[PDB]
Amino acid sequence: LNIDMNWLLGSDWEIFPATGDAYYAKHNGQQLFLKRNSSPFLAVLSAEGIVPKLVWTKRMENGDVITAQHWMTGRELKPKDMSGRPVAELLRKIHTSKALLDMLKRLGKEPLNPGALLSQLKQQSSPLIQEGIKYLEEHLHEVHFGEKVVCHCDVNHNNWLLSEDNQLYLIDWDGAMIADPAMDLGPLLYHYVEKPAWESWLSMYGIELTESLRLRMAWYVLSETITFIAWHKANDKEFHDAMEELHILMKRIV
Ligand SMILES: Nc1ncnc2c1ncn2[C@@H]1O[C@H](COP(=O)(O)OP(=O)(O)NP(=O)(O)O)[C@@H](O)[C@H]1O
């Protein structure tokens, strides 16, 4: 059976799908990671060293942007790995990159405000859910922050890559939003770092564990958990497991 993949280059290259439009490509000992219609964001991710660096780009006759990247050799990070200095430093580099911020803006991205976000929580809802949305409305007064930055928004450990060359990368940048840094820092510390270590983690990151941070973080991790159960209402398997994860999260925040 033919594989619908003849937009290409060189017949001496193995090509097969590998998230998104991801195909690998092999010839001699050179592997590439190829993507169809990637965002102009990718150029800045490569220049900043966040993802494996670009190798070439070709604009198709239709106008498809085909990009080749170094194919990284290594492994995903395990949850045990998420407390290392390198994870905190790379996340700090994303959160302070004015060049990444500049691209997202040029691409027409809304600064993401907890106001409009809490409104989007339209869920249909168990009793624990009702008390959850209470906590979010009765703390909106304290979840403000003026300096919005690039956030990746799915900082799950499987999106972190580690190379045999001692390079660390963070990938999958479709949910990139302009938002409060807490929107990433919260889910990361809550899920993978024991709270006696939070202040030392944030010191590697380069941020003091202030009291607006404790509230902002708890707000968005709770907000994240509720918007995830919401999603499984369209499925019915991980919906009954998220609730148990929300139950524990609720206990930690009074
Ligand atoms: N430039 C890249 N962008 C995104 N993901 C990449 C990139 N390069 C590699 N990957 C991912 O990294 C993994 C490939 O690393 P690799 O070490 O070859 O895989 P492995 O399963 O750990 N070992 P192997 O089974 O022998 O191929 C896959 O998850 C790829 O999707």
Author numbering: 1 to 8, 12 to 21, 25 to 129, 136 to 246, 249 to 268
Please quote the paper that reports this structure.
CcrZ is a recently discovered cell cycle regulator that connects DNA replication initiation with cell division in pneumococci and may have a similar function in related bacteria. The CcrZ structure most closely resembles choline kinases, consisting of a bilobal structure with a cleft between the two lobes for binding ATP and substrate. Instead, CcrZ shows activity on D-ribose and 2-deoxy-D-ribose, indicating adaptation of the choline kinase fold in CcrZ to phosphorylate a novel substrate. We show that integrity of the kinase active site is required for ATPase activity in vitro and for function in vivo.
The structure of CcrZ-AMP-PNP was determined by single-wavelength anomalous diffraction using SelenoMet-CcrZ crystals at a resolution of 2.6 Å. However, in contrast to LicA, the cleft between the N- and C-terminal lobes is wider in the CcrZ-AMP-PNP structure, which could provide insights into how choline kinase activity may be lost in CcrZ. Inspection of the AMP-PNP in the CcrZ structure revealed that the adenine base is sandwiched between hydrophobic/aromatic residues lining the bilobal cleft (F39 and W77 of the N-terminal lobe, and L173 and I183 of the C-terminal lobe) like the LicA-AMP-MES structure. However, in contrast to the nucleotide-bound LicA structure, the orientation of AMP-PNP is in the opposite orientation in the CcrZ structure.
